[PDB]
Symmetry: none
Subunit: 194 residues, 4 copies
DNA sequence: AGATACTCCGGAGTATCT
DNA sequence: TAGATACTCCGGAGTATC
């Protein structure tokens, strides 16, 4: 419904100053309206975070998951979906951060175990990759190294584009994709051909 | 210059890292060092001043290790790899001092701040860009005398320092890590970053 | 509509005048208009934001009352005395407001402020300086073309405005004032600032 | 010793003018003197005592240089002008002290000694504005001063003479003679007004 | 002598609530 | 939804100390 626009504003606000330095009537002003709407839809302020995680976490699936079925190597295919991952990062940025804003933060029972579910839907999103580099090393397209660290260091590095990439808000599909491609070419290819 | 100031900075750095700058109180930091709130305010006048003190120590403590390798013997990548391990070596050592120097930029325009604090905060937000610069400046000459691939400098340096610091989202603590046993792993992940993945 | 906010400003402006910014608490301002801390905080993000709201309004009124007197006829002197009476008139009727535009310059560097607050305050302070250089322009017109003695127009401006505002010291407000009584007193005050004493 | 206190009050008064009484902390004053709070409290039982100590000093400081001019020869205007300019240069060299004389009386906890001390200290200020109130009354009586309300002309005169701290900041390295030279220009406008006769 | 801390407590700011 | 209730926690004056 009309819930979509508060999250589009709450996501960036939650990314802007963090969850704490974000007050709730701060987001009441970024979508100029009643702050009762906020509670009539969301039973508490943490509901907003779970919702932005909710409509975010699965949002990433829809872009990158289709690239698992596409044929080819581990490299030929991991770069295919990791591009889509950081492609998605450059488009819905605010959501992308709220899928990791649990790092610096009592609760309710239903609200808490809500978060437990999405946390493993992130696990299984990450573990989708953890397979493909396990195959990637075995296949021979990927530099023979520890298969369980490289998963940790990919989604460490894939999500890390939020650190330096600010926004363009109008960058076409071409230029998000073509910077999504030379960012993973930097990570998958490393630097130094000899 | 830190006798008991050092152990205030040390204890608050962990707290800011495990429960955020928001949710750590001064009498939290007080308990962590065995005294009460009055001692901490005897050595710092605001709470944000504890933060800036960790921010300044955390960066003096990384340019002391890495900057020696700027003029290290060898190739641009050989210096670069030298640099980027020392960066991770102290990240893994002082993960507490690190989580505050890289996660403290939103304050810029959105928090009540005396000017002395505010312009001292952005004084380090440009101190870091010099640390970023001395990397960038060797990803350049890593290519001028051809030690690395011809990809554009800026993004390569921008992506890398982002990569170098992204080790805190998963790095555990191996209680009793020797000075080379972080080196056995720091050097592991820089070469996964410089070498990337995939043969010829 | 937004006339509850005016009550908060009216209450805050007075409470700031007497008690001062530090000793005025939100619950106090909440008491002056008979509500809780909440209603004060429903119309303002911070306490320094009600301070800027009094400043902004205060400068808005005094510029409205005084400005139509410089583009007016008469000499540079007769215009100067016309604005100067109007300025002290604003003093005598709304001095809870004038006292915050006339005090609060220290916040510049030693008080904690969001940069919207520090910048928004710096804006009004140059709204001040542009108001005050209306006076500078006219003393020069008065001095040069006949009206006023050939004195240092910079010091004359610095003095005059400081004398114009020094009325905050000895002035309090008779219960149920009348603006007819205050216009005569304001012109009495102005008579000695431009006329001085002596011969 | 006795010098050490004087630079507490010096630094205190200066801070009180720039931050105001409320916004200067005890550790603030400790810094401008380069010391610790346990010194200032060894030296002063409360922070308000700091305020009255400089109130009490800055008032005998201003009176010690202006009484010689109320008995000084000259008509009303002459000595009144001479009184005022002496009062002004006082504020131009001590305006940390000069400001503090009008920044006070039952608001916050005011241990009975110092409320009794304070509104007594206010009395010597009223008696101070009386020497003027007299000589302006003595000035309108002879003819050196024009025929105006002696009560109002007193209030508006020293109100004005104290309003110098609005624009005069400090120079800290100004000669006595360039201070006295500027103080007269100020009072030449306060007394002479602005506007000729022809 | 007077430097180090303790301790008491106001008072701004917040989430949430009927 | 407005304005309200209850509450966290920073900072400051003041005192107690080995």
């Amino acid at each position: 419904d009309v819930k979509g626009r508060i999250l589009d504003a709450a996501a960036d606000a939650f990314m802007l100053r963090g969850f704490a330095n974000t007050t709730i009537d701060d987001i009441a002003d970024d979508v100029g309206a009643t702050k009762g709407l906020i509670y009539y839809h969301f039973r508490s302020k943490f509901d907003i975070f779970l919702a932005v995680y909710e409509d975010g976490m699965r949002r990433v699936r829809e872009r990158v998951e289709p690239y698992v079925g596409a044929p080819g190597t581990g490299r030929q295919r991991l770069v295919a979906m990791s591009v889509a991952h950081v492609e998605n990062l450059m488009i819905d940025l605010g959501y992308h951060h709220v899928v990791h804003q649990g790092v610096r933060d009592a609760l309710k029972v239903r609200q808490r175990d809500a978060l437990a579910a999405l946390n493993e839907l992130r696990r299984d999103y990450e573990r989708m990759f953890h397979h493909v580099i396990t195959e990637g090393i075995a296949d021979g397209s990927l530099r023979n190294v520890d298969d369980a660290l490289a998963t940790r260091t990919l989604l460490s590095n894939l999500n890390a584009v939020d650190v330096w990439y600010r926004k363009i808000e109008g960058q076409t599909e071409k230029e998000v994709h073509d910077l999504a491609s030379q960012v993973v070419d930097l990570l998958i290819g490393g630097i130094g051909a000899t």
